[PDB]
Design an enzyme around this catalytic site. Structure first.
Site, mmCIF file in Angstrom:
data_model
loop_
_atom_site.group_PDB
_atom_site.id
_atom_site.type_symbol
_atom_site.label_atom_id
_atom_site.label_comp_id
_atom_site.label_asym_id
_atom_site.label_seq_id
_atom_site.Cartn_x
_atom_site.Cartn_y
_atom_site.Cartn_z
ATOM 1 C CE1 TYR A 93 -7.548 -10.415 0.622
ATOM 2 C CE2 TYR A 93 -6.963 -12.750 0.692
ATOM 3 C CZ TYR A 93 -7.762 -11.723 0.208
ATOM 4 O OH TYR A 93 -8.768 -12.010 -0.689
ATOM 5 C CG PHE A 141 4.644 5.275 2.330
ATOM 6 C CD1 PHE A 141 4.792 6.628 2.619
ATOM 7 C CD2 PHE A 141 4.077 4.445 3.291
ATOM 8 C CE1 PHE A 141 4.385 7.146 3.848
ATOM 9 C CE2 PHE A 141 3.666 4.942 4.518
ATOM 10 C CZ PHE A 141 3.821 6.299 4.801
ATOM 11 C CG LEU A 142 -0.515 6.487 -2.000
ATOM 12 C CD1 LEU A 142 -0.702 7.893 -2.587
ATOM 13 C CD2 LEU A 142 0.621 5.739 -2.688
ATOM 14 C CG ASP A 161 -6.217 5.973 5.948
ATOM 15 O OD1 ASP A 161 -7.279 6.465 6.366
ATOM 16 O OD2 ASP A 161 -5.373 5.516 6.719
ATOM 17 C CG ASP A 214 -13.174 -4.855 1.627
ATOM 18 O OD1 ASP A 214 -14.286 -4.391 1.973
ATOM 19 O OD2 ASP A 214 -12.299 -5.177 2.457
ATOM 20 C CG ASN A 259 -9.470 -0.121 0.632
ATOM 21 O OD1 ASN A 259 -10.139 0.654 -0.051
ATOM 22 N ND2 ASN A 259 -9.928 -1.305 1.043
HETATM 23 N N1 LIG Z 1 0.655 1.999 -0.165
HETATM 24 C C1 LIG Z 1 0.130 2.297 1.028
HETATM 25 N N2 LIG Z 1 0.492 3.435 1.663
HETATM 26 C C2 LIG Z 1 -0.140 3.577 2.823
HETATM 27 N N3 LIG Z 1 0.105 4.692 3.591
HETATM 28 C C3 LIG Z 1 -0.433 5.107 4.792
HETATM 29 C C4 LIG Z 1 0.098 6.356 5.361
HETATM 30 C C5 LIG Z 1 -0.408 6.864 6.614
HETATM 31 C C6 LIG Z 1 -1.458 6.153 7.335
HETATM 32 C C7 LIG Z 1 -2.020 4.915 6.810
HETATM 33 C C8 LIG Z 1 -1.520 4.392 5.558
HETATM 34 S S1 LIG Z 1 -1.206 2.300 3.188
HETATM 35 C C9 LIG Z 1 -0.815 1.521 1.716
HETATM 36 C C10 LIG Z 1 -1.389 0.292 1.299
HETATM 37 O O1 LIG Z 1 -1.012 -0.253 0.119
HETATM 38 C C11 LIG Z 1 -2.434 -0.485 2.077
HETATM 39 C C12 LIG Z 1 -2.305 -1.942 2.269
HETATM 40 C C13 LIG Z 1 -3.304 -2.685 3.018
HETATM 41 C C14 LIG Z 1 -4.445 -1.984 3.583
HETATM 42 C C15 LIG Z 1 -4.576 -0.585 3.397
HETATM 43 C C16 LIG Z 1 -3.624 0.178 2.673
#
Ligand SMILES: Nc1nc(Nc2ccccc2)sc1C(=O)c1ccccc1
Length: 282
Positions: free
Chosen positions: A15, A74-75, A78, A119, A124
């Protein structure tokens, strides 16, 4: 937005684009998804009241200037990156088990609240230094819609089912589970038909016996090749029998035979589940 300081672009969602950003006022670090009806907006504001340790928290929804912004906690990383980083040695089975268990908890929760992800994929599924893993980027469908990874798509979706069930998420998670174990995508199709046929070649071409109603599905063709099912011993060799048993139930062709997240959590595979700490390189 002027309220946020885009630190880095962390992904090109469906999106929209997702950015790591800092709240100018609070200094809080978040994941900001930028998109671009109004009824789906309600469907969204509902995901906000979805609180569970295995579901990424949606902190804010801001609709302005022909753009929709979703602010998420923020995590750290992935699962796709972690799997890639762990490719030489593989993710330790206890951690694979812990992650699967937690994801099943998240789905059991979503599903009991009538929310489907639609998905799921390694990209994700988000992890943190503490050993948790969380579902992120829930798919809405039934709204905005009407390259894209098909590797985790349930067969009923590929065959044109118009109304899929919670079972589609179990299928996706089963494919992810297999991948964590073997360090190779289970069904890496490069098109809907190649995806469908890779599933058929491994699990056998479905028929009315194992999947009542399959031959009457929108995109089913009598002309589909008839492949014989392969043994799981060859499908996910490093997985013990409890794991293979569970996986086979997550990959049943018939959505109605496919194990539910709640039932999966009670599977013998999780008898010795623990919560190990991952070795994360941030
Ligand atoms: N909360 C969050 N933290 C993320 N952290 C992160 C840290 C390092 C590398 C990639 C993602 S991604 C992420 C997402 O809510 C997200 C949104 C759309 C597609 C995929 C994930």
């Amino acid at each position: 937005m002027e309220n946020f300081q885009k630190v880095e672009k962390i992904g090109e969602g469906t999106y929209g684009v997702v950015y790591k950003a800092r709240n100018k006022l609070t200094g809080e670090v978040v994941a900001l998804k930028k998109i671009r009806p109004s009824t789906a907006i309600r469907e969204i504001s509902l995901l906000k009241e979805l609180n569970h340790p295995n579901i990424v928290k949606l902190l804010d929804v801001i609709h302005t200037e022909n753009k929709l912004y979703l602010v998420f906690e923020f995590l750290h990383q992935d699962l796709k990156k972690f799997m890639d980083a762990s490719a030489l040695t593989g993710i330790p089975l206890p951690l694979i088990k812990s992650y699967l268990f937690q994801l099943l908890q998240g789905l059991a929760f979503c599903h009991s609240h009538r929310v489907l992800h639609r998905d799921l994929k390694p990209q994700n599924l988000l992890i943190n230094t503490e050993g948790a893993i969380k579902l992120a980027d829930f798919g809405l469908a039934r709204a905005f819609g009407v390259v894209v990874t098909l590797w985790y798509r349930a067969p009923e979706i590929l065959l044109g089912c118009k109304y899929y069930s919670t079972a589609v998420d179990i299928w996706s998670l089963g494919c992810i589970f297999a991948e964590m174990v073997t360090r190779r995508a289970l069904f890496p199709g490069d098109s809907e038909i190649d995806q469908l046929f890779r599933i058929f070649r491994t699990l056998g071409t479905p028929d009315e016996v194992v999947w009542p109603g399959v031959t009457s599905m929108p995109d089913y063709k009598p002309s589909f090749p008839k492949w014989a099912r392969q043994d799981f011993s060859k499908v996910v060799p490093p997985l013990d029998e409890d794991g293979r048993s569970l996986l086979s139930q997550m990959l049943h062709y018939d959505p109605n035979k496919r194990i539910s997240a709640k039932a999966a959590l009670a599977h013998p595979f999780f008898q010795d589940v623990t919560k190990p700490v991952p070795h994360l390189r941030l």
